[PDB]
Every structure is written in C-alpha cells, then in structure tokens.
Amino acid sequence: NEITIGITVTTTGPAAALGIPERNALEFVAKEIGGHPLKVIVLDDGGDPTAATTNARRFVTESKADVIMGSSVTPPTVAVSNVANEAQVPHIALAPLPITPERAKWSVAMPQPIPIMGKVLYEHMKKNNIKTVGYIGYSDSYGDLWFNDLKKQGEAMGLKIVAEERFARPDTSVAGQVLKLVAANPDAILVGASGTAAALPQTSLRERGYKGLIYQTHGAASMDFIRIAGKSAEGVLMASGPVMDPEGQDDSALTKKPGLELNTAYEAKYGPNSRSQFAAHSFDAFKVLERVVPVALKTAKPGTQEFREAIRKALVSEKDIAASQGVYSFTETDRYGLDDRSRILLTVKDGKYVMVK
Numbered sequence: 001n002e003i004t005i006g007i008t009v010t011t012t013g014p015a016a017a018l019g020i021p022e023r024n025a026l027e028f029v030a031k032e033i034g035g036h037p038l039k040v041i042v043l044d045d046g047g048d049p050t051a052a053t054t055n056a057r058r059f060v061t062e063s064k065a066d067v068i069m070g071s072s073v074t075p076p077t078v079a080v081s082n083v084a085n086e087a088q089v090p091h092i093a094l095a096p097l098p099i100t101p102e103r104a105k106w107s108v109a110m111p112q113p114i115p116i117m118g119k120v121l122y123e124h125m126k127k128n129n130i131k132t133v134g135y136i137g138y139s140d141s142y143g144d145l146w147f148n149d150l151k152k153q154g155e156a157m158g159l160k161i162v163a164e165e166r167f168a169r170p171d172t173s174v175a176g177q178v179l180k181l182v183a184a185n186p187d188a189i190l191v192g193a194s195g196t197a198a199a200l201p202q203t204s205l206r207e208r209g210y211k212g213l214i215y216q217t218h219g220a221a222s223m224d225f226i227r228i229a230g231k232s233a234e235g236v237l238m239a240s241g242p243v244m245d246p247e248g249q250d251d252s253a254l255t256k257k258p259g260l261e262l263n264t265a266y267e268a269k270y271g272p273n274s275r276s277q278f279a280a281h282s283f284d285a286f287k288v289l290e291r292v293v294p295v296a297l298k299t300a301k302p303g304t305q306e307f308r309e310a311i312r313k314a315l316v317s318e319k320d321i322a323a324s325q326g327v328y329s330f331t332e333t334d335r336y337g338l339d340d341r342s343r344i345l346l347t348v349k350d351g352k353y354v355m356v357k
Contacts, residue, residue, distance in 0.1 A: 002039040003293065003302045006059025007282070008052050008070035008080060009094065014170075015047035017195030017224040019072035021266075021279035022094055028265045029286030034297040041065075045076050052076035056083035066307055069285050070094055072278070073169075073194065074142035081107040090311045092285040094278075098141060099335045108288075108315055110281040110325065112343055113336040117218050117239035118149045120343050121190070122157040124237055124356070130187040130213060133159045136177055136201045137192025139166035146192030146217055154190075162186045169197055178204045187212050194219025199228035206232040213237065218343075222276035226351060233348040237356065240346045241325040243280035245355045248344075255341060258287060259324035273352070277325075284323035291318045 007026075009019035023042055031038055041063060045051035052071045059065040060083060069092040070080045077095040084091035085106045093109040125133070135150055137143035143166055150161060163184040165177035178201070181189060189212060191201045198220035205214060216225070216238040226233050242249055246259030262283045263275045292314035300306035321328040326342030345356040 001036065001302055003033060003036045003067075004039045004041070004059075004063055004065045005289075006055070006063060006065040006068045007040065007042045008045045008055035008059070008068070008076070009042065009282075010047040010072040010076070011044040012046050014196040015073050017222060018095070018219075018278045019044075019047075021222065021276045022072060022282040024270065025262065025266060025279035025282045026286075027269070028262060029283055030290050033290060033293045036297075036302055045071055047071070047073055047076060049075045049079040052079045053083055056080045057087075060084070060087040060089050064303055065089060066302055067092065067289065067311060069282070074145075075140055078103075078141065088305065089308055090315065092288065094281045094285065096142065096145060098145065104333065104335055106312065108330050108335050108337065110284050110288075111277075111336075112218060112239075112241060112326065112338055114145045114149045114217075115153055116338060116340065116343055118146070118153050120345050120357075121215050121237065121239055122154050122159065124345055125159060125188055125213075125215075126157055128213070131158070131160055132162045132184075132186040133188045133190060134163035134165070134181045134184055134186040135161060135190050135192060136165045136167065136174060136181060137190075138169055138197075140169065142194065142219065143192045146190070150190055150192075167200075169193075171197075171200070174201055174204050175208075178208050178210070181205070182208050182210050185212075188215060189213070190215045190217075191220070192217060195222065195224050196228060199225050199232075202229040202236065203232040215239075218277050221346065221353075222278060223273055226348060226353070230351075233351070236348050238346045238348075238353075240344055240353075241277050241280055241342060242344050243324040244275060244277065244346060244353060245344060246324070248355050253341065254320075254322040254327050255324055258283075258322060262324050280324045284325050284328070287323040288315070288321050288328060291321050 043055040091107040295314040296310035330337040
C-alpha cells in the first residue's frame with residue numbers, strides 16, 4: 001500500500017514564484033520508499049492562510065496523510081504547522097516560520113533559519129565598514145523575523161539601525177517608506193521580503209536616488225527577482241542556500257552532488273539559470289523522507305497514527321541528512337537542524353548571480 005504525502009504550496013498569484021518551483025521539483029524526487037509507492041497530493045493555497053488550513057485539514061483527516069508539507073510563504077506555513085501539531089502529523093515546512101512550543105513537536109523546517117542567513121549579510125557589512133542600516137520589510141511574521149534578527153544579531157555586529165519601515169506583500173508602491181529611508185541616508189538597507197515583492201524596494205530605492213548598499217534575504221533567491229528589478233539588481237548582496245552555486249562548492253562538500261543532481265535535472269527541463277532557493281526545499285524534504293521513512297517502516301505500516309509517530313521519532317534520531325541546501329540534523333528543540341554549510345552570499349553582475357563567498 002501507498003505512503004500518502006499532502007503538499008500545500010502557492011501556485012497562483014505572485015507567491016507562485018516560490019511555490020511553482022517547489023511544485024516543479026516534485027518531478028525529480030523519490031517515487032517510492034521501502035517498496036511503497038508515494039501518493040503525492042498537491043494543492044494550491046494561493047498563499048492564503050485560510051486556504052492552507054483547509055488543504056491541511058483535508059490531507060490530515062480525509063486522505064489520512066502520513067506527512068504534510070508546505071507552504072511557500074511564512075503565514076500559510078504557520079497555519080499548516082498549527083493543523084499539523086493538532087492533528088498529530090509530521091510536517092515539513094517549505095518556508096521559514098517562528099517555532100513556538102505549539103509548533104515544535106510535529107513540524108520541521110527546510111529553509112535556513114533567518115539568523116544563519118543574517119550572519120553572512122552582517123559579516124559582509126562589517127568587512128566593508130558599513131555602520132548605518134535601514135530596514136524595509138513585510139508587515140507580517142516574515143518581516144518581523146528579519147527585523148528581530150537585524151535588531152538583535154545585527155546590532156550585536158556593531159550596526160546601528162536608523163530607520164524601520166514596513167509594507168504589505170501585495171503593495172505596489174513603497175514610495176512614502178522609501179523617502180523616509182533615503183532621508184535617513186543609511187550606509188545600507190536590508191530588505192525583508194521575497195520573490196516578486198523583493199524587487200519593489202530594489203527598484204524604488206534606486207529610482208529615488210538611494211546610493212548605498214542594498215541587501216536581500218534568501219527569500220529573494222531566484223531569477224524572478226533579477227527579471228523584475230532589472231538594472232536596479234546590480235551589486236545587490238543576497239543571502240542564499242548553496243544550491244544556487246553547487247559548481248563552486250568543493251568536491252568534499254556533502255551538499256555538492258545533490259545540488260548538482262537537482263539543478264541538472266531542473267535546468268535540463270526549465271532552461272538555463274532556472275535553479276532556485278525554492279525548488280531545493282521540496283527536493284530536500286524528500287531526501288529527509290528517504291532517510292526517516294524506511295526507519296519508520298521497521299515498526300509501523302503506512303496509513304496509521306503509529307506510522308506518523310514513528311516518522312516523528314525518526315526525524316530526531318537520524319543525523320546528518322545530506323541535501324542540496326545543507327546537512328540536516330533535527331532535534332526535539334531544533335526544528336531547523338542546519339549549520340554554516342548551509343549558506344553563501346550572492347551578488348548580481350550583468351543580470352546574473354555570482355557567488356561572492
């Protein structure tokens with residue numbers, strides 16, 4: 001019999017920049033584990049926490065999913081995590097989320113934790129003698145995480161935050177906010193945003209004569225940003241998973257071969273430079289499944305609560321799961337499980353991503 005996996009990701013609207021590659025990458029992941037076929041149900045949630053919740057409730061109660069995953073952006077991901085921790089179903093998040101005790105038991109997260117990504121950003125800042133920084137980010141939980149980290153790790157690195165501004169995901173101008181940022185004239189701005197919307201502050205800043213450095217989060221790491229921000233993208237510094245550049249990893253790097261293996265297949269189909277931060281999350285989720293699922297199969301059969309529980313326990317017992325974005329070791333309190341083998345710094349030169357470090 002089948003192992004059932006329910007995935008809710010955004011394939012419509014502008015957050016589809018993140019969910020469409022996560023969905024596309026399912027073509028290349030395992031098809032069966034321990035001789036059981038994978039039944040993989042994927043449903044669009046349009047980026048909406050209400051829709052993600054409904055999809056998750058359906059997966060968990062009607063399809064009797066063994067594992068759920070999603071979503072593509074933080075707020076629907078919090079929602080799925082809440083369903084999962086209540087229904088008692090293993091959940092692999094495909095976007096960062098704040099891990100509270102309510103969420104920690106049943107959810108793990110594939111994306112690098114914000115502070116690991118911020119460190120690479122702030123280190124580049126210090127080395128370049130940047131001191132004043134301004135922030136523009138989402139007025140939701142992803143914007144908060146990145147602002148909380150700038151305030152905390154960022155100030156701990158000797159930076160002074162001079163301005164904080166926020167905008168909503170669907171906003172089409174940040175005119176008023178950018179004028180406040182430009183006025184404070186900071187040495188650098190951090191943009192706490194992602195895909196399509198990450199390019200809004202990028203273009204708006206340059207068009208209003210901002211002269212400083214602009215830094216972007218791993219939420220921005222796909223071609224869609226470059227496509228939209230055009231020349232405004234040039235010289236940006238962006239945090240990224242190492243899947244954006246497996247070619248430049250050393251041959252001993254555990255992430256090298258799966259990164260190459262994902263990217264070769266994905267770019268074979270979708271065109272040159274079509275790789276992303278985002279395709280690699282669903283790919284990596286299935287690499288974790290390839291490790292913990294045969295462990296769970298020792299003590300329970302698919303389709304049961306005993307099977308859900310056994311996967312839960314396997315997630316915390318199996319160390320060093322090599323994937324394209326890092327080497328994952330989850331624990332009962334660390335639901336991200338990643339260290340520094342899981343980040344690089346990109347910039348954009350001539351409409352292309354180049355690895356800085």
